[PDB]
Ligand binder design. Structure first.
Ligand SMILES: C[C@@H](c1nc(N)nc(N(C)C)n1)N1CCCCCC1
Length: 330
């Protein structure tokens, strides 16, 4: 089997992407944030505290003839941005782009933190990291991809995120029309539950490539590119007026700037992030100070190849017995 679904930016800045997902019988379509940095499929629901729901579409398990309470199971998750959610668990039929999993754990939110409430466009998350990170207790549950894997034509999914435009998540096949040149595959460590890999270095604009190992995670659920302070300082030093602002929370730059590109290495191959991809616009409405799309990972404890990086590539998440990651230009 295969599946193919379009993923769409939630706003004009590509702060996140949403992908329609069919849950239950008859189908209830919710727009979920596909997140290769976590491993829970959770949704706003009829059980979510009413004051914490503000415009989201909810899953109502009582209206699904295939929903079954997973007795005694609860979940609770906290994300790198400080957001969180928790609740109980159903199993139900879940389909993405024509690919159907029966008996998928659908984690129903009883509580969500304010950032979730405040974002009307995201109805929940669909985790695509390794199932070892799944938070369901006392019986850990599998991701949608893990459940689907054995049925797929090939044990892979691909992320093809757009810049200020829709893109695609495919399951079970590689669309050879979706990228240019070849796909370069690179080793993955699953030890922390992530799609963790080591970039071979970087360049800023037209500058020379610096060969240096940068361990980090391919994370579709993180907006920005978080890298070591040394790398980030080298990038922003090429932008007149750019500075790190503790009050704002990162590097900012004059909105009048033209940003240089940023290149990262994948083995001997190179992925170029155009300068425009690194512009996240005014820090507040009407400001001429703009927020940068490359930020320091110092304090996070891990480097994160988020959407800013991933959207510049066609990315293969290869879930074979020994997982790997592939990157192609596009
Ligand atoms: C300045 C703001 C911001 N502005 C823009 N334009 N874009 C962003 N991102 C995160 C894309 N973030 N946040 C900075 C981040 C930490 C503290 C909270 C405030």
């Amino acid at each position: 089997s295969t599946g193919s679904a379009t993923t769409t930016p939630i706003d004009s800045l590509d702060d996140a992407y949403i992908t329609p997902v069919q849950i239950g019988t008859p189908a209830q379509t919710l727009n979920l944030d596909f997140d290769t940095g976590s491993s829970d499929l959770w949704v706003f629901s009829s059980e979510t505290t009413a004051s914490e729901v503000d415009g989201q579409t909810i899953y109502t398990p009582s209206k699904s003839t295939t929903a079954k309470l997973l007795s005694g199971a609860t979940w609770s998750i906290s994300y790198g941005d400080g957001s969180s959610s928790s609740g109980d668990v159903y199993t139900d039929t879940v389909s993405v782009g024509g690919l159907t999993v029966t008996g998928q754990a659908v984690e129903s939110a009883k509580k969500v933190s304010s950032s979730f409430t405040e974002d009307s466009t995201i109805d929940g998350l669909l985790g695509l990291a390794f199932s070892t990170l799944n938070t369901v207790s006392p019986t850990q549950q599998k991701t949608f991809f893990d459940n689907a894997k054995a049925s797929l034509d090939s044990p892979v999914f691909t992320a093809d995120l757009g810049y200020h435009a829709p893109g695609t998540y495919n399951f079970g096949f590689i669309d050879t029309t979706a990228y240019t040149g070849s796909i370069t595959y690179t080793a993955v460590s699953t030890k922390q539950g992530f799609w963790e890999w080591t970039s071979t270095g970087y360049a800023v604009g037209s500058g020379t490539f610096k060969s240096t190992s940068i361990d980090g995670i391919a994370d579709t659920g993180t907006t920005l590119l978080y890298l070591p302070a040394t790398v980030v300082s080298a990038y922003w030093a090429q932008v007149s007026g750019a500075k790190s602002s503790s009050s704002v929370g990162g590097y900012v730059f004059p909105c009048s700037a033209t940003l240089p590109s940023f290149t990262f290495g994948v083995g001997s191959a190179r992925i170029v992030i155009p300068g425009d991809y690194i512009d996240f616009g005014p820090i507040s409405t009407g400001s001429s100070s703009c927020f940068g799309g490359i930020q320091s990972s110092a304090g996070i404890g891990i480097n994160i190849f988020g959407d800013v990086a991933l959207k510049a590539a066609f990315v293969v998440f290869n879930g074979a017995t020994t997982p790997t990651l592939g990157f192609a230009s596009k």
